[model samples]
Target: MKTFEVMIQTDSKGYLDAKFGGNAPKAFLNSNGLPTYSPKISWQKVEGAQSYALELIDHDAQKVCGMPFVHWVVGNIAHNVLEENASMMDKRIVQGVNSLTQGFIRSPLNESEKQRSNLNNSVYIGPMPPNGDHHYLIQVYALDIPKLALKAPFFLGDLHDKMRNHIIAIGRKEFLYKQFVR
Candidate 1:
């Protein structure tokens, strides 16, 4: 089996505690045993990778009904190199509609309470499940296409069709998040 690593980052203010500071996202933390918040998360970019695509699959749905929810879809990532946190928005890359239809990003500050309340925003909204830790899986697919042919507002299923027979290799990282009751 091929081994890969995935690191997650956060700004000082922090994005979503539900997804960033617990045993939910993936169990790697700092030496202090607290959530590890670094600027860059690295892994083996994978060999023979022409291009990269990052996706997230929700496991609960899959386990119960074989339906995997796609939380994030990013293509045009450079292979054999680090995918910087904000670099997915670089000119050459493409960000599809996350579970939500608002394009690739939304913030709690600017979005409606309902929109912000939901985890489907086009932006990477960290998981803040009510009861327990929510797990978000990040998938990196190595594709033969130097670039994917997709546009905004495209759902995960749509991209799956476009990616069929185009995939070469795949890597994944799982992370978790839970809300802190104030």
Candidate 2:
């Protein structure tokens, strides 16, 4: 078997900018930091680097609650690309539906109705939990499967099931964000 390396990043603990769409910095997000929105999810480019998926799990919560939260789900990202950012990069990447009513789930909704609605995404929605310090983990999965069989609007759960056994290698990055309060 061939081995490779991948890196991960998060927008907490002073690693990323707090403003500007919660976008990850280029250093951690992209290679040249050309001011692109897409952040670097991982870098495992090699002849042997083939068939893989990217996954971010909230291990801290999973260990405590027995369920790890999925933060981001990306499949079929080109190996040659090497890095990605927060911005949507066309259809090249299929942005899995996040754990929020909206595409971006950064903070907690003050409204009860919104909270219930957020659960629909079932993916990593970031540290918006109530009353406590929360940490979000960004993970990358180097899978044996070259591509995932999921379409957009699919919840993270679906991707998890499909990529369970396909995972080959993994890299993790952790950051903490708090509920936005005035």
Candidate 3:
């Protein structure tokens, strides 16, 4: 049952270092002052798998924003790497929606934070945890089907529901991103 392997494609290995020292690259920043970009990711092909999906989230977000945060969600990946900034530049893949999509952010996120987040709707948002060092989880699921039934701006629930019993294999990676502004 050897399916495949998935990996976060960056020299940063276990942190948001971006090979730029102990911090993430300025290009990865999205809301506060710079634009947003997707992180580079690659996965091994699954035996008999037709397509794949990617999910990147910050579980530690619960402590700061009262809930986990999703930075990226996508389906129908026919390639190995969701190349850098694919959320904004890639054309062959299907985009689901990130936490910033539409009205997803509320409450724990102050009015200002909500507005700032909204600016990155439906696209990959680089990490900028305001409270503390946050660990991000990046996962890739190999699917039996070629694509999930989803449209842009769809939530994780929608993708999960459609992917029920359809996953052939999965791989995950974790990264600690230290807040640089502090």
Candidate 4:
């Protein structure tokens, strides 16, 4: 049985309409040229869920960019709530490499090479799908353990391996994203 429900505040059509910090329009790309604040994802609590894991996957990317592009992956959030832009804050939380890590990264270029390395891997690079619209999946996994056996610089493959059979429950939400040219 699905014991967990992912709670997201979207528009009438399941568009993730949440806006960024200090922005007027409820849009993806802000004037800062970076993605607006990330989605503030919270999962309804359930028994035996020691900690939670989350991944945002672009289902349409398989055809558009090849393979299901992983937008974000996070493990071991202390609480069910991962506040918006929390990915930007280094809470020492563990995260897997998103699709951006595989390309040329230009954000936060001032950090040391070591620190800058993980930025592309863990940060929430928002969805800008092609040909007008695309489909994305936001999944929350209720795990039986508080932490997984992995570290930074990890990928989705390694994450699923560590999560293995410890997942207690799973919930998924589909988002409809239309292109918004800045």
User: What TM-score does each of the candidates earn?
Assistant: 0.60, 0.57, 0.78, 0.79
The best candidate in terms of TM-score: 4
Instruction: Flag regions of model 3 displaced more than 4 Å.
Output: 1-4, 9-13, 18-35, 105-120
Q: Per-residue lDDT for 1-77 in model 2, tens only?
A: 34455554554454433331123333432343222343455565654445555665555555555666556666676
Candidate 3 lDDT by residue in tens digits, 1-182: 34466676443446655422124555555446443666678887778788888888889888887889888788888766788768878887776567655555454776765554444476676777777667888888888888777776577787899889998888888877766563
> Candidate order by lDDT, highest to lowest?
4, 3, 1, 2
Candidate 2 lDDT for residue 59: 56
lDDT of 4 by residue, 1-182 (tens): 46667876677976765253222254545455656367778878867888888898888888876788888888887688888767777485688777766322455455466355565556666677655667678888888898887777777887898888888889887776666554
lDDT of each: 0.54, 0.51, 0.71, 0.72
Winner on TM-score between 2 and 3 is 3
The TM-score measured for candidate 2 stands at: 0.57
- Quote the positional error of residue 142 for candidate 4 in Å: 0.8
Of candidates 4 and 2, the better by TM-score:
4
Model 3 — which ten-residue stretch has the worst lDDT? 17-26
RMSD of 4: 4.6
Candidate 1 lDDT by residue in tens digits, 1-84: 344666555334433343344343454443433332322334576666678777766665455445555555667766543443
